[PDB]
Each structure stands twice: as C-alpha cells, then as structure tokens.
Design a protein around this ligand. Structure first.
Ligand code: BEF
Ligand SMILES: [Mn+2]
Length: 128
C-alpha cells in the first residue's frame, strides 16, 4: 500500500493508540492521527484526507460499532476501510461488527504479526 496513506487510530486508552501508531510506523506508515472516541473520530474524518480507520469498540461518547455504522451510512466515507481492534471476543460481537461492514476484526491482546497480516488482508481485498 501507499506509504502516505493517512490512518486514523481510534481508542479510548492512550496505551493502545500508542501501540497501534508505533506498529504502523514500523510498517512504514507515518501519516497517522489519533482519536479518543467515535465523536472525536468523526470530527477528524470530516476534515478529510483519511484512507484507513483502525478502531476500538468500547469507548465513551460514541462506541466503535456506532462509529463503523456511521461511516458506512455516510456517502462521503462509506467505503473507508475500518479495521476493528477490540477486547470483545464473543461471536455475537464479531457477527454484529462484520454485518455492520467491518473490513477486518482483531481481538486484543494481539501480536505485531497479527496486525500486519490483517492489514495486508484488507489491502489485498481492496486492491490497495
Ligand atoms: F475497549 Be475495546 F473494545 F478493546
Ligand atoms: Mn476501549
């Protein structure tokens, strides 16, 4: 994928945002911004230019399933890649996120290799 691809990393825990941002840097992606919940995310997205969203689920103000649904329903951003990265591991959560249009889903805790693999799977699916 294009190394200038602009990522938005959304998680309500600063530790997890730092993990994901650092992993992206190792993969050669430095154009990375952060958000703390779905509302903060949407504000950043409105500003434009984003090419990929990595999102937590459990967050105050707007949770990540609502964020994913909002993105998918909005004409300006309906095709934005959204990778869910969450501690929710139950199949009903996986099903609800998949049905809502998630591009992929990673369960926390996750290894660097898992994040790379799942990002690549999405790049290949979308021809990026
Ligand atoms: F708080 Be997240 F869904 F891991
Ligand atoms: Mn959370």
């Amino acid at each position: 994928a294009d190394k200038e691809l602009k990522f938005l990393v959304v998680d309500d825990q600063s530790t997890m945002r730092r993990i994901v941002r650092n992993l992206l840097k190792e993969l050669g992606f430095n154009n990375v911004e952060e958000a703390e919940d779905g509302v903060d995310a949407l504000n950043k997205l409105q500003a434009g230019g984003y090419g990929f969203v990595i999102s937590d689920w459990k967050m105050p103000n707007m949770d990540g399933l609502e964020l994913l649904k909002t993105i998918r329903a909005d004409g300006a951003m309906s095709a934005l890649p959204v990778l869910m990265v969450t501690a929710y591991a139950k199949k009903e959560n996986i099903i609800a996120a998949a049905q809502a249009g998630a591009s992929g889903y990673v369960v926390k805790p996750f290894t660097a290799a898992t994040l790379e693999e799942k990002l690549n799977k999405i790049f290949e699916k979308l021809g990026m």
